[model samples]
Target: RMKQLEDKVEELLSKAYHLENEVARLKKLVG
Candidate 1:
């Protein structure tokens, strides 16, 4: 159970990192 939780968190962080880059890209386009 503990390992599963950790793995899930890692995936979330990965997706968040990817989303952060996407937001930055959008901001650049708007600016």
Candidate 2:
């Protein structure tokens, strides 16, 4: 259960990082 929780947190972080990077790219393209 602990490992599963850690895995979920890692996945969430990866998603957030991807989203942040995507936003940065979009800002550059827009401006």
Candidate 3:
């Protein structure tokens, strides 16, 4: 159970980072 929780958290962090990077790219293009 603990391992599963950790994996889920890691996945979320990775997704968040990817989303943040995409946003930064879009902002750069706009600005």
Candidate 4:
């Protein structure tokens, strides 16, 4: 059960990391 939660947290981290990259790219286009 604890491992399952940790895996979810890792998934969120990677998702957030990709989101940040996309946000930065979009900001440049809209800037």
List the pairs of residues colliding in candidate 1.
none
Runs off by more than 4 Å, candidate 3: none
Candidate 3 lDDT, tens digit per residue, 1-31?
A: 9999999999999999999999999999998
Lowest lDDT block of 10, candidate 2: 22-31
Q: After superposition, how far is residue 28 of candidate 2 from its true place, in Å?
A: 0.5
Worst 10 residues of 4 by lDDT: 22-31
lDDT of 2 by residue, 1-31 (tens): 9999999999999999999999999999999
lDDT per residue (tens digit) for residues 1-31 in model 1 = 9999999999999999999999999999999
Give model 3's TM-score versus the native structure: 0.87
Question: What local distance difference test score does each model get?
Answer: 1.00, 1.00, 1.00, 0.99
Point to the candidate with the largest TM-score: 1
Against the hidden reference, what TM-scores do the models get?
A: 0.93, 0.88, 0.87, 0.92
Order of models, best TM-score first: 1, 4, 2, 3
The better-scoring model by TM-score among 1 and 3 is 1
